[PDB]
Amino acid sequence: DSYTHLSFYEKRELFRKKLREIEGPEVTLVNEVDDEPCPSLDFQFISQYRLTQGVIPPDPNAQSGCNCSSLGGCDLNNPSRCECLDDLDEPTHFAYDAQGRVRADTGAVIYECNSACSCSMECPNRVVQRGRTLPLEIFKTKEKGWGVRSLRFAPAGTFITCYLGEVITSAEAAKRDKNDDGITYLFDLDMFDDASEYTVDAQNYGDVSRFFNHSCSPNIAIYSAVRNHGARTIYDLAFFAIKDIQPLEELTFDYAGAKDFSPVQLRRQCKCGSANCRGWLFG
Ligand SMILES: Nc1ncnc2c1ncn2[C@@H]1O[C@H](CSCC[C@H](N)C(=O)O)[C@@H](O)[C@H]1O
Ligand SMILES: [Mg+2]
Ligand SMILES: [Zn+2]
Ligand SMILES: [Zn+2]
Ligand SMILES: [Zn+2]
Ligand SMILES: [Zn+2]
């Protein structure tokens, strides 16, 4: 809707109310830049993928887990016991260190524990699952529309959040004609399969990561975090810090290979401002 019957204050207060109702750590809104009161009030905040028509989810009959049974669950210092890690090359280790941060030597694929595993929810191998721990702020950037930044220092390897949205088909992707601003592009789930062609559209439903902007010099990156032992047509898109992040520093990831820069079928350039900037065109 245009929401013309709602005033600057009413609209902004409604977006704030909407943020307050998110579970886990606080999310704030700020626009010290222009008088855009808030992002779309239609947008919904979800804690897991919102599946759609024709999207076959992983079969819980193909689920397997582990036998590690001790205090705190699975033992960082003994990864060769944990069946959840068998698909890794030697030397097997968990993706996470004693600090609960992704290791510098961890590859693109994180293998987390699942409902099938005997370990409790406090397992070191359920970091993504336990979700965001940092307070975040949706703020108005100078040239790139809305953006997100942390209120707290974040060491490299710190888990931030997952990219959520409607999971949709190629057929559905074509049916949605996307152009205007606050238009997200699609995030292919192509890390493993190609037949699936499942994609994540955060226009109407998503996470705070829906407001993360592109940088050619990013401070966060996507780790494909797999739990379910079926076919991997659907898996978690997990943001971790790849650089130490100052308070109030804009969270940016490299969209290339992940989030599209144009609608599936005039243009606006990259404003990340990095010296290495590739001048990537949007739309
Ligand atoms: N480096 C960059 N330069 C210019 N526009 C950018 C950008 N990174 C992201 N964007 C914009 O952000 C969109 C993705 S959705 C991210 C949040 C968006 N800024 C909003 O206001 O809701 C892109 O389609 C593009 O329009
Ligand atoms: Mg890709
Ligand atoms: Zn475990
Ligand atoms: Zn285990
Ligand atoms: Zn396990
Ligand atoms: Zn750039």
Numbering used by the authors: 195 to 373, 376 to 461, 473 to 490
Quote the study's own text.
Based on the Clr4 structure and sequence conservation, we further chose to mutate three phenylalanines that intersect orthogonally with the GS253 mutations on the surface of Clr4 (F256A, F310A, and F427A, referred to as Clr4-3FA). The Clr4-3FA mutant showed very stable biochemical behavior and crystallized readily. To determine the effect of the 3FA mutations on the folding of Clr4, we solved the structure by X-ray crystallography. These efforts resulted in a 2.46 Å structure of Clr4-3FA. When comparing with previous X-ray structures of Clr4, we observed no significant difference in global or local protein folding between the wild-type Clr4 KMT domains and the Clr4-3FA mutant (RMSD = 0.37 Å). This indicates that the Clr4-3FA mutations do not induce significant structural changes. In contrast, Clr4-GS253 and Clr4-3FA showed complete loss of binding to H3K14ub under the same conditions. Comparison of the specificity constants ksp shows that the efficiency of the UBR mutants on H3K14ub drops approximately 27-fold for Clr4-3FA and 48-fold for Clr4-GS253 compared to the wild-type. In contrast to the enzymatic activity on H3K14ub, the activity on unmodified H3 peptides is only mildly affected resulting in a ksp, that is, 91% of wild-type for Clr4-3FA and 78% for Clr4-GS253. The model suggests that F310, which is also mutated in Clr4-3FA, is unlikely to be involved directly in the interaction with ubiquitin as the N-terminal residues 253–256 shield F310 from interacting with ubiquitin.
